[PDB]
Amino acid sequence: EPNSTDVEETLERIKNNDPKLEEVNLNNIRNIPIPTLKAYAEALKENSYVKKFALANTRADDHVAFAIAIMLKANKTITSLNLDSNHITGKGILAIFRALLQNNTLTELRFHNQRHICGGKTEMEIAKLLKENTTLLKLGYHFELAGPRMTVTNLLSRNMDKQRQKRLQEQRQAQ
Ligand code: NI
Ligand code: NI
Ligand code: NI
Ligand code: NI
Ligand code: NI
Ligand code: NI
Ligand code: NI
Ligand code: NI
Ligand code: NI
């Protein structure tokens, strides 16, 4: 259904900060140039209306992951990011988790089913990095190592608890 037409036009709309574009979905669109995927990331940096960005199954690679990481350090709007079924490696994934040190607005990240498998050292490091982020509530990924898997689940439950705590101590103290 969507195609290179929509891809160029939607990108313009992002750059223009169109208030009516709250969701960008590129899922399953083939033959998007890597630099076009990068441009999406670059445009989204200062976009104030896009809440969800989904690029699943676009052949996005680490260059795309790096571009997205940069954008994540700046963007205060996107709450849900879908990277499933792409060519992102553990490097691209670490860059994103390092970016999340600087991001308190993204609550859902999913990278299921990458064609290049993450690696244990990367899973161990994701868990270490996630400790420093208190706003991510959902991580779409299935861990190979039982240890990082447990730690990440506990961290996500923690973050869920931290968000209720913040809201409650706002409501309580605002009387
Ligand atoms: Ni879809
Ligand atoms: Ni493929
Ligand atoms: Ni590349
Ligand atoms: Ni390169
Ligand atoms: Ni690949
Ligand atoms: Ni997975
Ligand atoms: Ni999975
Ligand atoms: Ni292939
Ligand atoms: Ni499971």
Numbering used by the authors: 177 to 229, 365 to 486
Sentences reproduced from the published study:
Leiomodins (Lmods) are related to Tmods, and constitute a subfamily of three isoforms: Lmod1, expressed preferentially in differentiated smooth muscle cells; and Lmod2 and Lmod3, expressed more abundantly in skeletal and cardiac muscles. Lmods are distinguished from Tmods by the presence of a C-terminal extension, featuring a proline-rich region and a WH2 domain. We show that ABS2, and not the C-terminal extension, is the main factor distinguishing Lmods and Tmods as filament nucleators and pointed-end-capping proteins, respectively.
To test this hypothesis we designed Tmod–Lmod ABS2 hybrid constructs aimed at combining their respective pointed-end-capping and nucleating activities. Strikingly, at 25 nM both TL1ABS2 and TL2ABS2 had nucleation activities comparable to that of their full-length Lmod counterparts, albeit at higher concentrations the full-length proteins displayed higher activities. Importantly, both TL1ABS2 and TL2ABS2 had much higher activity than the wild-type ABS2 domains from which they originate. The structure of TL1ABS2, the strongest of the hybrid nucleators, was determined at 2.1 Å resolution, and shows Tmod1 residues Glu-177 to Phe-229 followed by Lmod1 residues Ala-365 to Gln-486. What is more, the side chains in the hydrophobic core of TL1ABS2 have the same rotamer orientations as in the two parent structures. Therefore, the strong nucleation activity of TL1ABS2 is solely due to its amino-acid composition, and not to changes in the overall structure. Curiously, the hybrid constructs combining the capping N terminus of Tmod1's ABS2 with the added affinity of Lmod's ABS2 were better nucleators than those of the wild-type proteins. The ABS2 of Lmod has the required affinity to recruit two or more subunits for nucleation, but by adding a pointed-end-binding element, we have limited the ability of this domain to bind along the length of the filament when in isolation, that is, the hybrid constructs emphasize nucleation at the expense of filament side-binding. These constructs constitute the smallest single-domain protein with strong nucleation activity identified thus far.
